[PDB]
């Protein structure tokens, strides 16, 4: 869950960015990374309770996408009704999901208690320097390392050109329910294209916001509460950054796996119906 994902990663950075003021705590990351293990266990396995019949629903995408190697609407009804079963499954394991993420509120804020200062007018920046730099700043170099705007020009061209094959080849082939399934896949990659597109604007806007905000954080001091305001604030920068990029990689894998998928779909039809 996206604001839960912001919430979990946010309180992870309140956690660690709290507990690296104290330079003697270099081994507590075993305990808190072990709680990242704990939330992968509880969070990920509760959201795999829905992957009984949602992994069966990935197998239902297999039921769709090859007959060998009308009911578009009629079993589209079953698909969306079982999608009321999807957000219903989220809705009734929702008990468990809120327990998990608000337990990250729990251990997270109880790790915010673990920060202190010798004096409140000025404190250390061993914390945000050591944890931003030694845990975050290379991911900042990862998303900074990619021209995902020209790659949005690539994926933009993927929807454009794929609408060209859809145009001239739906304009030619048409015949069986293949066109309906192809259109479902194409609009799916267009919704994901919207996701990728705005989260690339989180890259262009928000990554620049990390660039702007990053000067006021490390190698300095504050009156303590302003420094803490930048622990929460930069923890939000980290939350939307990491959440946006993990979205970008799930949809990146599913994206280009679908690129080989529909690629061989356009290199799949003439091989069957043999035009002429």
């Amino acid at each position: 869950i996206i604001p839960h994902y912001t919430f979990l990663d946010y309180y992870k950075h309140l956690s660690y960015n709290s507990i690296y003021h104290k330079s003697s705590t270099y081994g507590k990351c075993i305990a808190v990374d072990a709680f990242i293990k704990k939330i992968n266990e509880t969070y990920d396995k509760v959201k795999s309770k829905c992957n009984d019949i949602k992994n069966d629903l990935i197998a239902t995408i297999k039921k769709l996408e090859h007959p060998y190697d009308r009911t578009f609407k009629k079993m589209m009804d079953e698909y969306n009704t079982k999608k009321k079963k999807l957000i219903k499954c989220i809705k009734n394991h929702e008990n468990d999901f809120n327990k998990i993420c608000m337990d990250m509120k729990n251990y997270g804020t109880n790790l915010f208690e673990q920060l202190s200062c010798y004096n409140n007018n000025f404190c250390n920046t061993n914390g945000i320097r050591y944890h931003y730099d030694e845990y975050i700043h290379k991911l900042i170099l990862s998303v900074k390392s990619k021209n995902l705007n020209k790659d949005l020009s690539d994926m933009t061209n993927i929807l454009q050109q794929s609408e060209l094959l859809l145009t001239n080849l739906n304009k030619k082939m048409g015949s069986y329910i293949y066109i309906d399934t192809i259109k479902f896949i194409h609009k799916e990659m267009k919704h994901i294209f919207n996701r990728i597109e705005y989260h690339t604007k989180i890259i262009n806007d928000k990554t620049k916001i990390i660039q702007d905000k990053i000067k006021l954080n490390i190698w300095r001091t504050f009156q303590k509460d302003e420094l803490l305001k930048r622990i929460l604030d930069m923890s939000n920068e980290y939350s939307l950054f990491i959440t946006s990029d993990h979205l970008r990689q799930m949809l990146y894998n599913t994206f280009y796996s679908k690129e080989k998928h529909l690629n061989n779909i356009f290199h799949h039809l003439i091989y069957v119906l043999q035009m002429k």
């Binding site: 061209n157 993927i158 454009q160 050109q161 794929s162 609408e163 060209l164 094959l165 145009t167 001239n168 080849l169 690629n263 356009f266 290199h267 003439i270 091989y271 035009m275 002429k276």
Partner: protein, 315 residues
Amino acid sequence: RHVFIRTELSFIKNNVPCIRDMFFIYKRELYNICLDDLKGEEDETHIYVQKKVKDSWITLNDLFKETDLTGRPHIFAYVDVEEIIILLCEDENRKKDMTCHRFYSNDGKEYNNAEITISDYILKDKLLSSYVSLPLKIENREYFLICGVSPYKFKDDNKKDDILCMASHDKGETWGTKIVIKYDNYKLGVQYFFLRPYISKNDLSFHFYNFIECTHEKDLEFVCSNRDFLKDNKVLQDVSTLNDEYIVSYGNDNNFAECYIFFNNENSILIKPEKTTAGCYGGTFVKIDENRALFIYSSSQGIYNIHTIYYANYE
């Protein structure tokens, strides 16, 4: 302006149908390559090489006994007037190591066969089917070619990787030559279909599902320039040339009902397969010499009907 076109008609029969057929001139004898595209209980591949001896198709020899089951296949014949080389290679799923088989004759009946092995063919992610081809002389030798087209490219990264022409040098014994074609009208997202390269007068010509007149650029790199033949539902389906100007038929509809032929924008006569419940598909502008031609299509089950052309210039 000043052209005299003597057009005329003839008739063939065949007892069983053959859908996709190949036509040419060998020693001025009307020949054929039949189709049995049935892989079922009572029919297999049965490709009969048929001469029309004055009324109807007479199979000069069969082809299924040599290549036992390999493959679908794709048929390629090169028209020398003394010899014709025929290869057979199947449809595309993993393998590039592609042992095929080679045919030789000097008649239509007595065939010499030849085991070849075209292993790691370079037409992976290229698309080809059967068509008639000719020799084609570049400065050293006449040459025989196999031109695999790229059907779809995402990006127009290069206009060189469109049509990939593996060429021979020794009648088709060894194919140690690859030839590049440049296509300048490469519209992305428009997956070009079913390339048909025909040969006219030691020059290059590609046609597909548009027309492109084609010319030499390099020893291996060639090019195609663009040229219109498109009007209101008037597709281009076959074109030959006499005196290097085109002769045009049409597919007027999607049923291939009755093809439309003009006298090079001067006059017009009409194809009349009724004076039934069939079409004019499969039309073959068979090329004889500088001044004579033929035309044969496929209308219904086992009936071919010749349209013969005599054409020179009075002025």
